[PDB]
């Protein structure tokens, strides 16, 4: 029972995603080179990758129905707290179970857990990250469910600093109902089974990954040697 409004929301989010996700990964040539041979050797390349992703996340969030109507302060707060989570979600499109790596076109842009450690992160984060990616890939989400989950993740009213939490919850409830109705009406069993519950559980997992990444980000960023290798956008969004 997907209403025209609900299909319209899906159409907007699908178009927003296709405008902001380049599955050819053509722009990876413009990043600083990945060097695999402190020696945070992958930090230049992955900082540019993450910085590039944040740009796409902002472009996607701006096209979420209702998001652009929020105040600038709330839009900023919502993007700052959700960016790391949306990055983890959108990277699942490139995540592969053949090898538990992120396959972005070529061997140069094939990222395993060694690259996340050569970006400065321990396995306090890498282990839950791979488990999240695997459990998310096993959901075999429709592209419609994938973009709705990203959108729902961004417009969460419980983010710190939100002013119009009821307006944010208004948007999210419409995306939530659209996702629920999409699963009932368009996702065939047995994949549909408890799909909404599993997808919302992934938002809880992302909160934990958000917390672990932040504590590791602040410890990495505290050393100016590492902060020098980040980008200005990364420093603005993730913090100084």
């Amino acid at each position: 029972k997907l209403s025209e409004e609900q299909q319209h929301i899906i159409a907007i989010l699908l178009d927003a995603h296709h405008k902001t996700y380049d599955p050819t990964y053509a722009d990876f040539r413009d990043f600083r080179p990945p060097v695999r041979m402190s020696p945070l050797s992958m930090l230049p390349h992955l900082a540019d990758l993450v910085s590039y992703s944040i740009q796409k996340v902002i472009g996607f969030a701006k096209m979420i129905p209702g998001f652009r109507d929020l105040t600038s302060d709330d839009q900023i707060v919502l993007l700052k707290s959700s960016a790391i989570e949306v990055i983890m979600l959108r990277s699942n499109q490139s995540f592969t179970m053949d090898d538990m790596s992120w396959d972005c076109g070529s061997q140069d842009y094939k990222y395993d857990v060694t690259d996340v450690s050569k970006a400065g992160h321990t396995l306090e984060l890498i282990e839950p990250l791979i488990k999240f990616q695997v459990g998310l890939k096993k959901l075999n989400l429709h592209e419609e469910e994938h973009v709705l989950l990203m959108a729902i993740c961004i417009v969460s009213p419980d983010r710190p600093g939100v002013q119009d939490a009821k307006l944010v919850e208004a948007i999210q409830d419409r995306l939530s109902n659209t996702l629920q109705t999409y699963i009932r009406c368009r996702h065939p069993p047995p994949g549909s089974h408890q799909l909404y519950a599993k997808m919302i559980q992934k938002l809880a997992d992302l909160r934990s990954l958000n917390e672990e990444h932040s504590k590791q980000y602040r410890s990495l960023s505290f050393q100016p040697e590492n902060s020098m290798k980040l980008t200005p956008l990364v420093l603005e969004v993730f913090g100084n």
Partner: peptide, 11 residues
């Protein structure tokens, strides 16, 4: 703490 790059990316 103020975010001019994020804001101009939001127009």
């Amino acid at each position: 703490k103020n975010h001019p790059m994020l804001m101009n990316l939001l127009k």
